[PDB]
Design a protein around this ligand. Structure first.
Ligand code: HEM
Length: 153
């Protein structure tokens, strides 16, 4: 897992995310959908959003990003002790939304990208390493729950 100092770095940059959860989520989704377009195909109501401005103007997308980042922020604040709130997330992502773990990696890449774009002075190498470890732990643990529910990563 992570050292206490690594968790502290994670929670330090997450409080910066929390000054604008909506805007970070929008930037993350726009990056994700651009970098990895197959990901958009999993979102039936965002597919008509053909341009960056349409994506930013969509309150449905903006709310979706806050919902995702809120759940992730709560997980990160448990500092690895997150079985109770990983279970429902794996349940829906595995059996309803059908999201491969590789897509969770794509979204992690977008998260790290946006964190650096917005907070370069507060997202240096040690903090980046910490966040990747924290997101890697999240993905590892949800991948195991995917298998417990059946059907692989
Ligand atoms: C940091 C990783 C992610 C987190 C924490 C997260 C969290 C959530 C949460 C909390 C919800 C609402 C409750 C539920 O349906 O479970 C949700 C919905 C959803 N997520 Fe994720 N998500 C993540 C990644 C992804 C990715 C990468 C995809 C698609 C490539 C995705 C697709 C969806 C879809 C389709 C819904 C339903 C939206 C709706 O119909 O309103 N999620 N997610």
């Amino acid at each position: 897992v992570l050292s206490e100092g690594e968790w502290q770095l994670v929670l330090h940059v997450w409080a910066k995310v929390e000054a604008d959860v909506a805007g970070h989520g929008q930037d993350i989704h726009i990056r994700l959908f651009k970098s990895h377009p197959e990901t958009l195909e999993k979102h039936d109501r965002f597919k008509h959003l053909k341009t960056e401005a349409e994506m930013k103007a969509s309150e449905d997308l903006k709310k979706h990003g806050v919902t995702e980042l809120t759940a992730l922020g709560a997980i990160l604040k448990k500092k690895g002790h997150h079985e109770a709130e990983l279970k429902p997330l794996a349940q829906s992502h595995a059996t309803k939304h059908k999201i491969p773990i590789k897509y969770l990696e794509f979204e992690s890449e977008a998260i790290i990208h946006v964190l650096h774009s917005r907070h370069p002075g507060d997202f240096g190498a040690d903090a980046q390493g910490a966040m990747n470890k924290a997101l890697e732990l999240f993905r590892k643990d949800i991948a195991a729950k995917y298998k417990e529910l059946g059907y692989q990563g």
